[PDB]
Design an enzyme around this catalytic site. Structure first.
Site, PDB file in Angstrom:
ATOM      1  N   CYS A 192       0.836  -1.336   0.089  1.00 55.14           N
ATOM      2  CA  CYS A 192       0.047   0.025  -0.132  1.00 55.14           C
ATOM      3  C   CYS A 192       0.718   1.253   0.066  1.00 55.14           C
ATOM      4  O   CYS A 192       2.220   1.128   0.332  1.00 55.14           O
ATOM      5  CB  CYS A 192      -1.109  -0.092   1.090  1.00 55.14           C
ATOM      6  SG  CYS A 192      -0.388   0.191   2.505  1.00 55.14           S
ATOM      7  N   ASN A 198      10.774  -6.630  -6.230  1.00 52.87           N
ATOM      8  CA  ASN A 198      10.147  -7.840  -6.005  1.00 52.87           C
ATOM      9  C   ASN A 198      10.482  -9.024  -6.803  1.00 52.87           C
ATOM     10  O   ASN A 198      11.144 -10.126  -6.363  1.00 52.87           O
ATOM     11  CB  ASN A 198       8.707  -7.928  -5.686  1.00 52.87           C
ATOM     12  CG  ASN A 198       8.276  -7.584  -4.299  1.00 52.87           C
ATOM     13  OD1 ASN A 198       8.146  -8.258  -3.434  1.00 52.87           O
ATOM     14  ND2 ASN A 198       8.143  -6.236  -4.017  1.00 52.87           N
TER      15      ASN A 198
END
Ligand SMILES: *[C@@H]1O[C@H](CO)[C@@H](O[C@@H]2O[C@H](CO)[C@@H](O)[C@H](O)[C@H]2NC(C)=O)[C@H](O)[C@H]1NC(C)=O
Ligand SMILES: *[C@@H]1O[C@H](CO)[C@@H](O[C@@H]2O[C@H](CO)[C@@H](O)[C@H](O)[C@H]2NC(C)=O)[C@H](O)[C@H]1NC(C)=O
Ligand code: A1IBQ
Ligand code: NAG
Ligand code: K
Ligand code: K
Length: 498
Positions: free
Chosen positions: A342, A370
């Protein structure tokens, strides 16, 4: 198929405006001709996943930046991309007219949209809830005879999940996570605040809590929904903190280790749901590698743990190599998965910044980071929020890729939506990350993957103001001559003949 209708709200870029009669959408997906590549481009200046095609060329000359695909240097396989069906997301979506609801869900889940294949489902209430409840609030019910799903599940979340799955051509995977147990299982007797399960792993309280996961899976299975994975607890570190403001349940890594080994692992393995994967941690990356060391060096816990779930608070700085890198080095056979991300959570920033290109760039930079650190999937937080970034019973408002404005029966697709879609739309489940080597120092962020059918995808993010000419080399196939404009994101796709 239908282009973005842009609107500015005074931030650095535009939102795309959708309503009961109009939403931007793609044509049915097709691959470019052999010897051609497809390029989808979004820009701060307002382009939104616009398609152009170009030739793959046999030859390349020049001393410009070259990115050479390493198709045989293989890394992780991708599970996918999606977001969370919180109570707040469900309320926001269902507050739209039926037509606009459908266009919102298609935006995320259909091949005319960005092809999400993951939905995270809270087990009962969280901060993105307007009511505080668990599924077993009747006290001292250790056999959970009074366990039941309330209307938040049966009237709101479950029907929307069914509708998402109907619109998807890709198989959708569900992930479940709890925030709190029933309060009568907790040391503090409250949904929030500092508190853990009473007693110790292996006892009645822990066995009841483990059985609650099976009751949950049973209840969703009665509604014809099956789960790919569950996490052992959302943000277990939060419940260790005095005054923690919303639903939590505190575990030290030792507590989680023992709970998995003695209660949750055995209970799931003994159930009809034994094929559900169990993910540990479900928390911020600075807890790694320590948490992984504590849990996975115990063979009795380790045998039940499929993966490590990580959260990304994109507003805050933390190291990647010392956390994800080190965890992968020490435990290469335990997959890493990003279960929540978020932005907009700082109290001093507007929760919702309609049209923020910077927040879009935070999403895509995070996703690239990631994927370059072996993570197999990426899951956004709330699928949709209101203009305040809610509802949220503790006013912990945040941003979302889709913002609903019920007074206009309108929703807005944020730059974050398109930055996520540059990945989700073009990286099917089972895609494998491959290497991509730069010929020289450069300011671009990029990742390459190979589809299950052998096709190539490359995402290139330029967070700089400068247009960067570059060439992508596929040693089997030839050269893609292109440009990465300042403040752009591109996805490239092509077929590979050998
Ligand atoms: C939904 O949004 C669309 C797109 O803005 C609205 O259609 C536009 O309406 C204006 C004003 O009449 C026209 O200038 C545009 O040509 C229309 N665009 C399109 C693509 O049709 C539409 O009226 C809105 N629908 C509702 C129910 O409010
Ligand atoms: C392992 O699974 C079985 C279900 O196959 C559980 O057995 C049930 O236990 C309840 C009471 O807890 C009985 O009312 C059911 O009749 C039992 N069903 C069957 C088919 O035997 C068993 O309790 C589980 N063991 C655990 C979780 O330790
Ligand atoms: N060219 C580099 C980035 N190289 S990368 O694409 O392998 C990459 C590595 C990461 F660890 C995370 C990323 F998001 C991307 C750069 C870019 C921008 C300013 C300085 C350096
Ligand atoms: C590519 O390079 C080779 C070697 O010089 C040349 O023969 C060929 O014509 C060049 N052009 C194309 C389009 O292949
Ligand atoms: K109940
Ligand atoms: K905020």
């Amino acid at each position: 198929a239908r282009p973005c209708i842009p609107k500015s709200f005074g931030y650095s870029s535009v939102v795309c405006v959708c309503n009961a009669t109009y939403c931007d959408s793609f044509d049915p997906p097709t691959f470019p001709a052999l010897g051609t590549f497809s390029r989808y481009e979004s820009t701060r200046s307002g382009r939104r996943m616009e398609l152009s095609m170009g030739p793959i060329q046999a030859n390349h000359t020049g001393t410009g930046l070259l990115l050479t695909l390493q198709p045989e240097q293989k890394f992780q396989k991708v599970k996918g991309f999606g977001g969370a069906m919180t109570d707040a997301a469900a309320l926001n979506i269902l507050a739209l007219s039926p037509p606009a609801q459908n266009l919102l869900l298609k935006s995320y889940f259909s091949e005319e949209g960005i092809g999400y294949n993951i939905i995270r489902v809270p087990m009962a209430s969280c901060d993105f809830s307007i009511r505080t409840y668990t599924y077993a609030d009747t006290p001292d019910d250790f056999q959970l005879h009074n366990f039941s799903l309330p209307e938040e599940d049966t009237k709101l979340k479950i029907p929307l999940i069914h509708r998402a799955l109907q619109l998807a051509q890709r198989p959708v995977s569900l992930l479940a996570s709890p925030w709190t147990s029933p309060t009568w299982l907790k040391t503090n007797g409250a949904v929030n605040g500092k508190g853990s399960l009473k007693g110790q792993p292996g006892d009645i309280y822990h066995q009841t809590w483990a059985r609650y996961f099976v009751k949950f899976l049973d209840a969703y299975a009665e509604h014809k929904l099956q789960f790919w994975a569950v996490t052992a607890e959302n943000e277990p570190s939060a419940g260790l903190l005095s005054g923690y403001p919303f639903q939590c349940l505190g575990f030290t890594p030792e507590h989680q280790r023992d709970f998995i080994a003695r209660d949750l692992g055995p209970t799931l393995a003994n159930s009809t749901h034994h094929n559900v994967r169990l993910l540990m941690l479900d928390d911020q990356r600075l807890l790694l590698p320590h948490w992984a060391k504590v849990v996975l060096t115990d063979p009795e816990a380790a045998k039940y743990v499929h993966g490590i779930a990580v959260h990304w608070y994109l507003d805050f700085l933390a190291p990647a190599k010392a956390t994800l890198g080190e965890t992968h080095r020490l435990f290469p056979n335990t997959m890493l998965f990003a279960s929540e991300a978020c932005v907009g959570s700082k109290f001093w920033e507007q929760s919702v910044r309609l049209g923020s290109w910077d927040r879009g760039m935070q999403y895509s930079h995070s996703i690239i980071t990631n994927l370059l650190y072996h993570v197999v999937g990426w899951t956004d937080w709330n699928l949709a929020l209101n203009p305040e970034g809610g509802p949220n019973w503790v006013r912990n408002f945040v941003d979302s890729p889709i913002i609903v404005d019920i007074t206009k029966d309108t929703f807005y697709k944020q730059p974050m939506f398109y930055h996520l879609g540059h990945f989700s739309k073009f990286i099917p489940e089972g895609s494998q990350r491959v290497g991509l080597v730069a010929s020289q120092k450069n300011d671009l962020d990029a990742v390459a993957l190979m589809h299950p059918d052998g096709s190539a995808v490359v995402v290139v993010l330029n967070r700089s103001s400068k247009d960067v000419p570059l060439t992508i080399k596929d040693p089997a196939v030839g050269f893609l001559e292109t440009i990465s404009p300042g403040y752009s994101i591109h996805t490239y796709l092509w077929r590979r003949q050998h």
